[PDB]
Amino acid sequence: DNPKDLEVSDPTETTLSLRWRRPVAKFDRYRLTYVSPSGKKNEMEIPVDSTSFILRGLDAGTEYTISLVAEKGRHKSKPTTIKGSTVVGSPKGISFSDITENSATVSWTPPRSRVDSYRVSYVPITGGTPNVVTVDGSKTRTKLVKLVPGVDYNVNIISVKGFEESEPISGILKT
């Protein structure tokens, strides 16, 4: 009897949350293998008492073929397979420079993940509707204009690849 309903939840940049149904048959343990697009196969043995396990140490915005199997002794059951891709990576550090009464140069350090663009949003701490500016993936910085003098600005930056958009990083910008 093989593990049924293997599903992946809560995609992270480096993790995937796995959940499945336990086998009706008596068994030893589980063996989880997952290979990357390069064909790198990783194994792990999971306790008979688990129906959930957080997969970790993965790369960002990468798809994985995940397969679970119940090892009954020396007999591995029929493999249960699914695919799960990690979410695209977040930029690593937001920094501000060339501040002024009306403009600032926000810059960020690029992630180790293929990226098409970045969505830089900014709004004053007191609230309002964001002002989003898109900039090409090769670019690592941008200029903000029309900035009101003396006011703290919440500035978020998000990576985008295809339709996938990572977790944002943010910083306060003081005009």
CA angle 52, 114, 160 (to 5 degrees): 80
The experimental technique used to determine this model is X-ray
Q: How far apart are CA 152 and CA 170, in angstroms?
A: 13
Q: Is 128 exposed, middle or buried (0-12, 13-18, 19+ CB in 10 A)?
A: exposed
Q: How far apart are CA 8 and CA 82, in angstroms?
A: 8
Nearest Cα to 107, choosing from 116, 122, 120? 120
CATH fold label, 88-175: Immunoglobulin-like (2.60.40)
- Is the separation of the CB atoms in 111 and 159 below 8 Å? yes
Q: How far apart are CA 119 and CA 96, in angstroms?
A: 16
At residue 119, the 3 state secondary structure works out as strand
Annotated resolution, angstroms: 2.5
What secondary structure letter does DSSP report for 162? Answer: T
Give me 51's structure tokens.
């129906």
Cα dist from 113 to 8, 15, 87, whole Å: 21, 15, 10
Give me 52's structure tokens.
């959930």
- To the question of domain 1-87 being in CATH 2.60.40.10, the answer is yes
Q: How far apart are CA 80 and CA 69, in angstroms?
A: 6
Q: CATH 2.60.40.10 occupies which residues in the chain?
A: 1-87, 88-175
What secondary structure letter does DSSP report for 23? Answer: P
Identify each DSSP E strand in 38-140 by its residue range.
Answer: 41-46, 52-56, 63-71, 80-85, 94-97, 104-108, 117-124, 131-136
Q: How far apart are CA 129 and CA 108, in angstroms?
A: 23
Q: How far apart are CA 12 and CA 113, in angstroms?
A: 13
Q: For residue 157, report the phi and psi dihedrals to the nearest 5 degrees.
A: -130, 130
